[PDB]
Every structure is written in C-alpha cells, then in structure tokens.
Design a binder for these strands. Structure first.
Length: 138
DNA sequence: GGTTACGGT
C-alpha cells in the first residue's frame, strides 16, 4: 500500500507519491530530496536562515533524502528533475548516523523486490493531496 | 556503497 511521508518509519519497505525538491548527482549515486508536504519527526529540520542555499522550501521537517544506487542511479540521473512528481514503490527506509530518516534504492539485478521510481504527470489526481497541502506552505 | 541539509557539479 501507499504511505504518506508522515507515516513512514525506519527499516521498512514503503511506497509513496512525492514531489522532487532537489537532485544531486555524483560519480557514486544519484540523490533526490522529496516531499509530500506532510511532516515526519525523523526528517531534517530544513532552515530558512541558511546563507546562500538554493533550497526554497519546504522548511522544517518536511522532506526526505533518497539515495539511488546502480540501475536506479543510471536511470534517474538524467531523467528525474527538480519539480517533477514521482511515485516510488517498494523502496527501503533507514536511519542515518545522525538519526534522520533516509530512503534507499539498492541495486536489485535479481529483481527480488519489485522496486521502481517513475514520473507522474502533474495532472494525475493521485497528486491532488500533495498540491492541496503545498498551498498551506506557500 | 556514501555523508550530513550544502554544493548547484
């Protein structure tokens, strides 16, 4: 089933709709920061006071970092863009060394876990709640 | 498999 981001907990498999806020590519992986405009106590409290950040919101504990490895990296790195909506299915969660939630997509060549990430056209009704909540923070 | 809310590649 699908969860809101406020509902996810560490060390589980989950699926959710979200909007991509930030992407970062490296030679090791591809990173997404995603939000569905619901709060989670385990998310990093994003500060509006940072000098010179390119982040424009949401602020506080409203976004989660996703680390994409292997085929997930190679597929998304020149495809998923900031602002895109995505549906992420059967991804894994963890807690990092500092105690924050993170989402991980490990390579799965064996096709054991049926993981996926795909773009969702902005017009899809599955995104209505994300859009209605975003209005609260603009 | 990586480190820390940036950097803006």
């Amino acid at each position: 089933s699908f969860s809101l981001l406020s509902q996810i907990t560490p060390h589980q498999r989950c699926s959710f709709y979200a909007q991509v806020i930030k992407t970062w590519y490296s030679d090791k992986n591809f990173t997404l920061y995603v939000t569905d405009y619901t709060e989670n106590e385990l998310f990093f409290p994003m500060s509006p006071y940072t000098s010179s950040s390119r982040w424009r919101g949401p602020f506080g504990r409203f976004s989660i970092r996703c680390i994409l490895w292997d085929e997930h990296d190679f597929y998304c790195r020149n495809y998923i863009k900031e602002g895109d909506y995505v549906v992420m299915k059967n991804v894994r969660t963890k807690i990092d060394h500092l105690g924050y939630l993170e989402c991980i997509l490990h390579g799965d060549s064996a096709k054991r876990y049926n993981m996926s990430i795909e773009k969702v056209d902005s017009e899809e009704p599955e995104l209505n709640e994300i859009k209605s909540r975003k209005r609260l923070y603009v």
